[PDB]
């Protein structure tokens, strides 16, 4: 607004120095907000009103990811979309709660409305080979399987994971592992809860039993940690994500 047009001194967009401007190209700047918000959350356990504040704040934070993607490119490519995928569960169980969030607008770019969201459009439009979704790396797919398991049936999630051959990319690359554990747990819960014993037993037992040791979806820290020392910051940063888990207790009932 008044821009584009970008005059006096020099402007670009890439590469040399402008430089939050250039990183907002692109949109690495928004990525840093995404990082820091996760941090705040990641330390404080849901209890007092702080949690409410961050949820409202996170709903706010969405909107930029939308808009920006209709400022469309510099290709860019990526950063805003990546943030959206990470943010997504989003939501959800069948989706509830997207509609409540959706509710200020202007919203824009592509994955919007409680008809969608549902994941799937982003996964589709942003590939897995050549162009996109690279760097990093394999993808949206784990989140799609998660989405499919919760708001569809555990048939769809199981089918997608076994078809896509994504079980050898979770071995190395450590964020993806936690995701892998997270989706396996959710699939077994979904299988239990729409109402057969097997596949639910098979999925869920495999996740369990072993290891103790469970940091692997949430929460919890291993042994030991957190007394020692400055190495806490590995198991408190791999990952665990907040506002999820999905319920402890519920998994235990399903397993037993």
């Amino acid at each position: 607004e008044n821009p584009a047009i970008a005059v006096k001194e020099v402007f670009s967009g890439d590469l040399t120095s402008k430089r939050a401007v250039i990183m907002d190209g692109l949109c690495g700047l928004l990525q840093k907000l995404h990082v820091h918000l996760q941090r705040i959350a990641q330390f404080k356990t849901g209890a007092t009103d702080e949690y409410f504040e961050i949820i409202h704040l996170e709903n706010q934070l969405v909107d930029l990811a939308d808009s920006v993607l209709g400022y469309y490119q510099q290709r860019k490519r990526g950063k805003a979309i990546c943030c959206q995928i990470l943010i997504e569960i989003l939501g959800s169980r069948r989706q509830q709660a997207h509609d409540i969030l959706y509710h200020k607008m202007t919203r824009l770019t592509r994955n919007i409305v409680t008809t969608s969201v549902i994941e799937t459009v982003r996964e589709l439009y942003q590939e897995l080979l050549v162009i996109g979704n690279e760097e990093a790396k394999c993808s949206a797919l784990l989140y799609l399987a998660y989405q499919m398991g919760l708001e569809g049936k555990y048939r769809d999630g199981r089918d997608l994971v076994l078809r896509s051959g994504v079980e050898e990319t979770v071995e190395k690359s450590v964020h993806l592992a936690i995701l892998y554990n997270r989706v396996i747990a959710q699939l077994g819960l979904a299988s239990f809860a729409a109402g057969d014993v097997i596949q639910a037993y098979n999925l869920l037992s495999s996740l369990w039993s072993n290891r103790n040791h469970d940091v692997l979806i949430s929460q919890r820290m291993p042994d030991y940690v957190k007394e020692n020392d400055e190495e806490e910051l590995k198991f408190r940063d791999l990952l665990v994500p907040p506002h999820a888990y999905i319920q402890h207790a519920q998994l235990e009932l399903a397993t037993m």
Partner: peptide, 9 residues
């Protein structure tokens, strides 16, 4: 195809 598990670190 039980699939299993996987832990790390």
């Amino acid at each position: 195809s039980e699939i299993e598990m996987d832990g790390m670190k």
